[PDB]
Structures are given as structure tokens and as C-alpha cells.
RNA sequence: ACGGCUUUUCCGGAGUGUAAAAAGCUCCGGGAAUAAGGGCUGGGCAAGGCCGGUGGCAGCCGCCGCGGUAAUACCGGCGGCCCGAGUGGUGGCCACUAUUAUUGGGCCUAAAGCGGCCGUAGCCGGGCCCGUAAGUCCCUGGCGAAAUCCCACGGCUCAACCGUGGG
């Protein structure tokens, strides 16, 4: 098999090999993994957990 | 692959890691090259590439792109410095480019090879030519661009067996990445070798920035990293 | 305007002194015992023309394109450069070595009628080899598959006698 | 400056006139179409010419080189104009005499003109009394009629 | 002054997607912009869109999904024949079947793939990939 | 030499028969016109006085030659139809 | 250096060929015999850090640059490289050149925005409904000689060349 390319939670684009992205468990519930790409972090875009629905940086 | 496996084994057992990612590699929690990318890690120890991609230490997988000597003026004469531009790769899907400086040529060559490893990237390969639709990863999957200084580079998919229709620096870099056929167009001062090489490297990196659909992956035979038969 | 002028059948290199190309071509010249560069260049051009026809036919559609597409495949398998079940994409994997293996010089050496490539060339030039009952003195002639096995010594040649001194030395190899 | 103009579908005449107007700013195009080189060429478009030697001279090399370059003054048969021509080779000036006839051709510098450390000389001697000068300088042949 | 409502709309969309906007408003609407938006939605380059009525020429509200590399008008609107699409593809697109050229035919507005299947030409008006 | 007849055609308008043939002869010179004519007239029962050989041609790397000949039923018709040069070259008549 | 072989080509003959000749082609006798040059050798750019001369003189140099008594760059010897019955010199056109730019260039500081503005022709022009069918797209009749170009098959030993069909 092959491997899956991670995707930003806010905008849905793929993460490039060496960009300044981040990922962490949901602060509210801890059941899902949030990914944020460099552009979304720079512009402070909001994000929403797909399980518990808690939103925002 | 028998030699470089034991080289990687030798390096691993006598290495004391100074960084968190180096520790993850030392303890067997990371076993593949593709697992160090796309998560924001800082890569600061060259032993990481030596363990995960040992074949970048072969002579056929390293190229010295150019050597220049530069001068600083002083009241006691001219102080001379060497600048070396070099590149490494695995001829499948990983490539890196680096610059080194030193008082003698050998020091600069060592440092330049060292910095190329630390600047490693993974790319995408495929077949996108109107006159060759073979779904094999011998070319770029679609047209891409890169730039540095006054230099602009555009890379275009080409038919199997065409060769690399590009200047020599671009030839060396593309060969180290595992690409056999391409067409190209350039603007600016290509005789500035540092900028020419950086523009080609940026163009290769930019294959990751194009948005694609699952259907496209089948149509162009897109492969990320190793071809993996 | 101007009337027709007959044009060269081969193309010259874009730069005369490139080290890598010189090394590659020297290896080929030594291996197949060619007389000069232009001979080699001739065969290179033949290969290029084949590929250029395949590249154009892949991106074409219509009724004449299909006829041309099947004619190209048929000609390539008649010369013995592709197997009977090949497709158009297979045209793009042909190498220069495929064409040189079809020279009458090479085939005379491969079958065991001579001991060396140089001897095969002299046998062809002096008129000791017959191809399907006809004597041909051109070492660069490309042999069709249908006539490959009817290639022998000429029936009027000194070599068409198993007791000839030079033939016994050829057979000892 | 805004967008390059005109871009319109029905603006063909103006676009063609613009391209024609600024093509006269290209010195290559202007010289060819106006035939300026033909108007001033002493060789009258020929690749070689024949002339008669009037005297021998020497030209100093330009800075920072030093040396004397040996040349001849030649009067051309076709129109009577006089031009200077270089004599290439070591000791070549010794094979030339006054009233001898020579064949000259271009010296081969940039833009079809002069070259090296001798600007002002545009031609070189190739034959002397219908014998190749290169042979004479090397040997292999003798200059006739003494 | 305003010369071309369709060019403004496509340049606006490509500017907005580069900074991650989730929706846009196309201010002077028209029927041709609506047909182009329908074709864009069919191939998955945009989400839902809706017409909003002022007393003026109307507004379009469009949802973006980050799936557009680039989009733009073609000026002048070159005529094209039914078997001549490849050279225009090489002019505007990055690989052999990558993206769409949008074509105005006497059978309506459609992608160049559908028109090539029908065997008709028309006028080029836009590209999206 | 071994002779093989390829075609015999009837031409009533001219009043002749036209004969195409091959000769197989490895290791031998090109056959002469006299020998070919004698063999042909024996092989077809012709009056040799009205038998004309048009040509005998050899090829580059071959062991055989191709030939063309004509046979008239009447001598006067032959003298009226055929050119003088071919009848002399075949020894039918004498050059003045 | 020994031992053996061959005869494309070469010398002398017979036949065929030809309007007649000559070439060409098939056979027979002799014999490795009868057959290599031009340019280059510091970088661009493949190839010498060897020897002997000359000493800012003579000379070389498309361009960059060599030569001022210890010249890898001039002249010559010996070596080496490229192409080869050819290989160098001079002049012209295209490419190189996105240095003419529709595709596809520039104009703050490098060549280049009229000192400023009003307006004629031209070019470019906001949304909806109905009609027309000039532009535009599709189908089909009559045309755009042959030679020249591309492909397959066939005839000259193959090819160049020539014929039959498709474009
Ligand atoms: Mg001081
Ligand atoms: Mg920069
Ligand atoms: Mg430039
Ligand atoms: Mg005329
Ligand atoms: Mg070299
Ligand atoms: Mg010169
Ligand atoms: Mg010396
Ligand atoms: Mg010398
Ligand atoms: Mg410019
Ligand atoms: Mg002003
Ligand atoms: Mg005004
Ligand atoms: Mg309108
Ligand atoms: Mg109409
Ligand atoms: Mg015609
Ligand atoms: Mg034949
Ligand atoms: Mg043929
Ligand atoms: Mg013909
Ligand atoms: Zn994002
Ligand atoms: Zn949650
Ligand atoms: Zn391909």
C-alpha cells in the first residue's frame, strides 16, 4: 500500500513537505486530530472539531 | 542495497541523538523516510538522512554543481573564500540542494554536502504529455514553474525517451530526483548558476502545491516519493 | 520558386565536443565495428523518425490516422523490431541497439558464419553471403524477419565447402 | 503603463501598423532593407577581390600590446579604390613586392569588420601572383618569375 | 469604465481563493455569468450559488471550496472549429486533460469536452483549472 | 545452362509470337546469343531463319538471366516490321 | 615475426550490353598486391604542465587574452584529439534572440509616459425581453493542373531513384 497525505481541517488543502504547519488533539474533547496549514495559521482562520463541534483558535 | 543497509546499521548503533526527531529515529518509532515530512519538524542532524536514506552517500548520487572563489578586501591584502554549490538525491523521489563555505575547497565541499541533506524534499512524478499517455512516473505530471533572482524556469511534461531538454545544471538536478524526460522554457540570467539551480529546485518543490482529484492520480500515474513496485 | 534538391538522410550533432556523448558513441562504434560516425548517425536518425511518427499518431484521431497507426505497427514487426502482439506505446521503448542488431554484418556474425565482426564485413563486401538466393554486398542492409533464416554462404563461394581451410577455422570457434 | 494595446478583435490594422513602425528601430532590419552596406562597400558585395600593390607599410598594435604589423596598400582592379590589407604569417612580408598582384578577402572580425589589436585593417592577403601565400610562408612551393 | 462583467467575476474569484475566502459576491450579474457558474459547479470547482435581487442587475452569492488553481476570461473571444481544440488546450491548460475551456455554441454554453463529443465549434470565453 | 519458358503470347496483328524466358547458370558466363537461339529453336520447333532474339540481360548478384525473343511466321513480314539494327546484331543479315 | 585466407577495388581475357561505342553486369587467369588527408591541441571546447628555438622583437588573437631570457597560448620536434575522401578560409540568409514580443518584451532609480488639459475619426463599451441571420459553428454540391511533401506495397542487389494506391 501507500500512505495518506494529511489535509488541513480549515481549508482542506494538502500539507506540503516543509511548511510551518501544526497538528494537535481537539482541546475540548480530545477525540479528533486538528491540522492547520501555514496560511490558515498566518491569517488566524477559525477551525471546528468534527466530533464535538467546538470551534475557534 | 546490501552495502547501504549495513552502512545504515553501523551509523545507527554508534550515534547519540541530540534532537527530539533524532531520538524518535534512534528508538525505532520512525522507520520510513516519508514519515519526517508534512508535520513541521525541524531537521538538524544529518544522521537522520543517513539512517533513513543511506544511498545519498554514494558517489553516483552526489553532484558538485559549482565552485567559486570570492574576495574580501583589507589593508593587508585580499582574503579569499571558497563557495561550493552541491546536490544529492536517491534517483527515485527525494532530492536536496546545499551551499557551503570554507578557507579551503575540501571544507566547503564537506559542509555543502552536509547542508544538502538537511534541505531534503519529496516531490511528485507522473506522465502528462499530450503525445505520450503511459501512466508511468518518468516526467513531471503537469507543467510547473519556479523562480530565484532574475531567473524564471518552466518545466513541461515530455514523451518517454525524449531526454532532458534543459541546461546542464537542470539536467543534473532532475536526474538526481529520478526524472528522465522534460521540456523547458527560461527567462533571466541562466549563467548565474546558484540562481538557476535554486529556480529548478523550487519548480520541483512546487509539484506539491497543485490541487488534484483522485481521478487525476489514475490518469497521470502520479507517484509521491518512491515508485514502490 | 526553386526546383527540388536532394537532402541528407542523417542529422549531425548540435555540438561537436560534448564528453558524455563522445564516450557513448565511441563504445557503440567499437562494439559494432562501424566505419565512421555518419554511418552510426544514419541509424540514429532512423530511430528518431520512428518515434516521431508514434508521437504524432498518439495525439491524432480520425480515419487516416488509424490506417497509418496499423501501417507503422505492421512495418515495425516485419523488420523484426517488435513482437507480434506489440502496441503503439511499445514504439517509445526502442533503443539504438535494437536497430544495430538488424544489420546484415551483425546477423552474419551472430549466426556463426564468421569469427569476428570485421570478418563478417569482409565476407559481405567480397561477395560470399547470399540472402534468399541473392548476393548483397551492403553490410548496413537491415534484414527482414521472414528472410533471416535463409542466409547462407553463396553457392559459388569458396566457403561453400566444409573442407575449406578458412571455414574450418571459423567452425572451430 | 497600462495593458499593452490594441488587444481588440477588430483592431488588426492598428496592430500591424504599430509593429511596422517600431521595426525601423532595429538597426539590423534598417540596414538590410535600405541596402546601406552595398552603398559603401569597396568590394561591391564580393567575397574576394584582386588588386595591385602600391607600397608596404607597418601599423602599430593597440594598447596594451606592442609590436609592428606588416601590411600593404592595394589598388583594386574593379573600381580603382585603395585599401589596406594585412599579410599573415612569420616573414610573410618578404614574399611581397611592389607592382605585384594580390587576392584579398575579409579579415574576419566582429560584424564583418576588423579584429584583434589592429582596428582599421579589414582585409588580408591570400594569394600573391596567383600562388597561395600560406604555402610560400611554409615552403612547399616557390614564387615564380624571381 | 466597466467593459466586461465576466472578466471581473473570474479575476475576483481567483483573487479570493488565494487568500482562503469561503464565499464571494459577484456584483453586476447577467445570464452568461450564470451559465458559466453552472458549468463550473458541474465539474466541482464551486459549491452552491444563488441569485439575489436588488433593483439593479442583480447579485450572485457563491460558495468556494479551495479547489481552483486558476480561472480567467479569454479576450478576444476567438472562434474555434470542432477538431481544433488541442492547440488551445496547450495554450491555456497544464496537461492533456487537465481543466476545462468554456465555449459558447449555438447549442448553449458548455465545456470543450462536451462540445468536442457533440462535434461542434464555437467561441472561447473562459478557462478554469 | 537450363532454360525455363515463362510466357508465350500470340500477336496476330503483327503476325508473330513473343517469348519470355529465364536461363539458370551458376558459375558460368552469360550465355551467347547463338547458344540461346539454338536451344530455343530445338525446344519449340521453330524455323531458325525467322527467330529473332530481342535481348539477354544479367543482373547484379544473380545466377540467372532474363531474355526476350520473337518468332515470325513469314520472312517478309519480319523484314518489313523489325528494325535493321536488330537483324544485323542477330546475324540474320549482313551489314553493308 | 611467423603460418594461412580473400579479391570489393587493380591488370590481362570471353560473353552480354549499345544505333555504333563506352560504362554496367555474369564468368576465367595473376596478386595484399594498386589506394589518407585536412584542421586543432590556455578557456569557451575533445585533446601535453614534455623537449629545442625566440625574448614586448618576431608572431598569435571570432571573443576573453598570450609574448618584457625559466612561454602548457608564438616557431619547430615528438606525442594527443575531432572529422574523414574529404577537411579548413571568406561573404550571405535562418536559428541563437522573449535583441521586434499575436502566441510573448519593456518605460521610479538602467534606453523609454507628450509640461498640462479639452476634444474629431478610429479602437473598446452596463442589465433584461422580442425579431433578424451579416459575422460565427455544423452538413453537403463545384473548384484550387502536374511535379514537389508524408505513409504502405511493388521494380532496379538494398538504397538514392521510379511505379500503384491512401493522405
Ligand atoms: Mg586599516
Ligand atoms: Mg528573491
Ligand atoms: Mg539576458
Ligand atoms: Mg522565377
Ligand atoms: Mg579539455
Ligand atoms: Mg581565427
Ligand atoms: Mg620553452
Ligand atoms: Mg606546437
Ligand atoms: Mg528588454
Ligand atoms: Mg507626464
Ligand atoms: Mg480626451
Ligand atoms: Mg452587453
Ligand atoms: Mg452563414
Ligand atoms: Mg498538385
Ligand atoms: Mg528486387
Ligand atoms: Mg523499397
Ligand atoms: Mg514518383
Ligand atoms: Zn489551511
Ligand atoms: Zn472535539
Ligand atoms: Zn509517458
UniProtKB/TrEMBL annotation, chain A:
Entry-linked InterPro entries: HVO_2753-like, HVO_2753-like_ZBP
Pfam family, one: HVO_2753_ZBP
Keyword Metal-binding tagged: yes
Other comment: The sequence shown here is derived from an EMBL/GenBank/DDBJ third party annotation (TPA) entry.
Keywords: Metal-binding, Zinc
PANTHER family per the UniProt record, alphabetical: SMALL ZINC FINGER PROTEIN HVO-2753-LIKE ZINC-BINDING POCKET DOMAIN-CONTAINING PROTEIN, ZINC-RIBBON RNA-BINDING PROTEIN INVOLVED IN TRANSLATION-RELATED
Disulfide bonds: 8-37, 11-37, 29-52, 37-40, 49-52
Name of the featured protein: Zn-ribbon RNA-binding protein involved in translation
Binding of Zn(2+) 2, residues: 26, 29, 49, 52
UniProt domain Small zinc finger protein HVO-2753-like zinc-binding pocket: residue ranges: 8-53
Entries under NCBIfam families matching the protein: PRK14890.1
Native species: Pyrococcus abyssi (strain GE5 / Orsay)
Binding site for Zn(2+) 1: 8, 10-11, 37, 40
Amino acid at each position: 500500500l501507500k500512505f495518506e497525505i494529511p489535509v488541513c481541517t480549515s481549508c482542506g488543502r494538502e500539507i506540503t513537505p516543509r511548511e510551518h504547519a501544526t497538528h494537535f488533539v481537539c482541546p475540548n474533547c480530545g477525540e479528533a486530530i486538528i491540522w492547520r496549514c501555514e496560511t490558515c495559521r498566518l491569517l488566524a482562520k477559525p477551525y471546528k472539531c468534527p466530533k464535538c463541534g467546538w470551534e475557534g483558535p | 542495497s546490501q552495502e547501504w543497509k549495513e552502512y545504515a546499521k553501523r551509523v545507527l548503533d554508534e550515534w547519540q541523538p541530540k534532537t527530539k526527531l533524532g531520538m524518535l529515529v534512534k528508538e525505532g518509532q520512525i522507520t520510513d523516510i516519508h514519515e519526517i515530512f508534512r508535520k513541521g519538524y525541524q531537521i538538524k542532524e544529518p544522521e537522520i538522512i543517513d539512517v533513513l536514506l543511506p544511498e545519498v552517500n554514494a558517489r553516483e548520487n552526489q553532484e558538485i554543481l559549482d565552485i567559486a572563489l570570492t574576495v574580501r578586501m583589507t589593508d593587508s591584502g585580499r582574503r579569499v573564500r571558497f563557495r561550493v554549490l552541491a546536490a544529492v538525491g536517491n534517483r527515485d523521489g527525494y532530492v536536496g540542494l546545499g551551499i557551503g563555505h570554507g578557507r579551503e575547497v575540501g571544507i566547503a565541499i564537506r559542509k555543502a554536502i552536509n547542508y544538502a541533506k538537511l534541505n531534503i524534499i519529496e516531490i511528485k512524478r507522473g506522465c502528462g504529455s499530450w503525445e505520450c499517455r503511459c501512466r508511468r512516473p518518468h516526467s513531471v505530471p503537469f507543467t510547473v514553474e519556479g523562480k530565484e533572482g532574475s531567473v524564471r524556469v518552466k518545466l513541461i511534461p515530455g514523451p518517454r525517451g525524449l531526454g532532458l531538454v534543459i541546461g546542464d545544471v537542470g539536467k543534473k538536478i532532475l536526474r538526481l530526483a529520478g526524472i528522465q524526460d522534460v521540456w523547458s522554457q527560461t527567462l533571466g540570467e541562466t549563467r548565474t548558476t546558484v540562481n538557476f539551480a535554486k529556480a529548478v529546485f523550487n519548480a520541483l518543490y512546487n509539484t506539491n502545491k497543485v490541487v488534484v482529484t483522485p481521478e487525476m492520480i489514475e490518469r497521470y500515474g502520479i507517484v509521491v516519493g518512491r515508485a514502490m513496485p | 520558386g526553386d526546383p527540388k534538391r536532394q537532402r541528407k538522410k542523417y542529422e549531425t550533432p548540435p555540438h561537436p565536443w560534448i564528453k558524455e556523448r563522445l564516450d557513448r558513441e565511441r563504445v557503440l562504434m567499437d562494439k559494432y565495428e562501424l566505419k565512421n560516425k555518419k554511418e552510426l548517425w544514419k541509424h540514429e536518425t532512423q530511430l528518431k523518425n520512428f518515434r516521431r511518427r508514434a508521437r504524432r499518431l498518439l495525439a491524432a484521431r480520425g480515419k487516416q490516422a488509424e490506417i497509418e497507426r496499423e501501417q507503422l505497427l505492421a512495418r515495425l514487426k516485419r523488420l523484426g523490431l517488435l513482437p507480434e502482439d506489440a502496441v503503439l506505446d511499445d514504439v517509445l521503448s526502442l533503443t539504438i541497439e535494437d536497430i544495430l542488431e538488424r544489420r546484415l554484418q551483425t546477423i552474419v556474425y551472430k549466426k556463426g558464419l564468421a569469427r569476428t565482426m570485421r570478418q563478417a564485413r569482409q565476407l559481405i563486401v567480397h561477395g560470399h553471403i547470399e540472402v534468399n538466393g541473392q548476393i548483397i554486398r551492403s553490410p548496413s542492409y537491415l534484414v527482414l524477419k521472414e528472410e533471416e533464416d535463409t542466409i547462407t554462404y553463396a553457392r559459388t563461394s569458396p566457403f561453400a565447402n566444409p573442407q575449406h581451410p578458412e571455414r574450418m577455422m571459423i567452425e572451430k570457434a | 503603463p497600462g495593458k499593452k494595446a490594441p488587444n481588440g478583435e477588430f483592431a488588426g490594422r492598428k496592430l500591424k501598423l504599430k509593429r511596422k513602425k517600431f521595426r525601423w528601430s532595429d538597426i539590423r532590419y534598417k540596414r538590410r532593407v535600405l541596402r546601406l552596406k552595398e552603398k559603401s562597400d569597396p568590394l561591391e558585395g564580393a567575397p574576394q577581390a584582386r588588386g595591385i600593390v602600391l607600397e608596404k607599410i607597418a601599423v602599430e598594435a593597440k594598447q596594451p600590446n606592442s609590436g609592428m604589423r606588416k601590411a600593404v596598400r592595394v589598388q583594386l582592379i574593379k573600381n580603382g579604390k585603395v585599401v589596406t590589407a594585412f599579410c599573415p604569417g612569420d616573414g610573410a612580408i618578404k614574399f611581397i613586392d611592389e607592382h605585384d598582384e594580390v587576392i584579398i578577402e575579409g579579415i574576419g572580425g566582429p560584424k564583418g569588420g576588423s579584429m584583434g589589436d589592429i582596428p582599421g585593417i579589414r582585409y588580408k592577403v591570400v594569394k600573391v601572383n596567383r600562388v597561395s601565400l600560406k604555402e610560400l610562408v611554409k615552403g612547399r612551393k616557390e614564387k615564380p618569375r624571381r | 469604465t466597466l467593459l466586461d462583467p465576466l472578466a471581473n467575476a473570474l479575476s475576483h474569484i481567483t483573487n479570493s481563493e488565494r487568500v482562503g475566502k469561503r464565499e464571494v459576491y459577484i456584483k453586476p450579474a447577467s445570464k452568461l455569468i450564470g451559465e458559466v457558474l453552472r458549468v463550473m459547479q458541474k465539474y466541482g470547482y464551486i459549491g452552491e450559488f444563488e441569485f439575489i435581487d436588488d433593483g439593479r442587475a442583480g447579485v450572485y452569492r457563491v460558495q468556494l471550496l479551495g479547489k481552483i488553481n486558476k480561472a480567467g476570461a479569454i479576450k478576444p473571444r476567438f472562434p474555434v472549429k470542432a477538431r481544433d481544440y488541442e492547440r488551445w488546450e496547450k495554450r491555456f491548460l497544464p496537461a492533456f486533460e487537465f481543466g476545462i475551456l468554456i465555449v459558447s455554441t449555438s447549442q448553449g454554453v458548455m465545456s470543450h469536452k462536451e462540445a468536442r463529443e457533440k462535434g461542434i465549434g464555437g467561441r472561447l470565453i473562459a478557462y478554469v483549472y | 545452362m537450363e532454360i525455363k519458358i515463362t510466357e508465350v503470347k500470340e500477336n496476330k496483328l503483327i503476325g508473330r509470337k513473343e517469348i519470355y524466358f529465364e536461363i539458370y547458370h551458376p558459375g558460368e558466363p552469360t550465355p551467347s546469343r547463338k547458344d540461346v537461339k539454338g536451344k530455343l529453336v530445338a525446344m519449340l520447333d521453330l524455323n531458325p531463319e525467322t527467330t529473332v532474339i530481342q535481348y539477354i540481360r544479367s543482373y547484379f548478384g544473380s545466377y540467372k538471366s532474363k531474355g526476350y525473343a520473337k518468332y515470325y511466321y513469314d520472312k517478309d513480314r519480319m523484314l518489313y516490321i523489325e528494325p535493321e539494327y536488330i537483324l544485323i546484331r542477330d546475324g540474320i543479315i549482313e551489314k553493308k
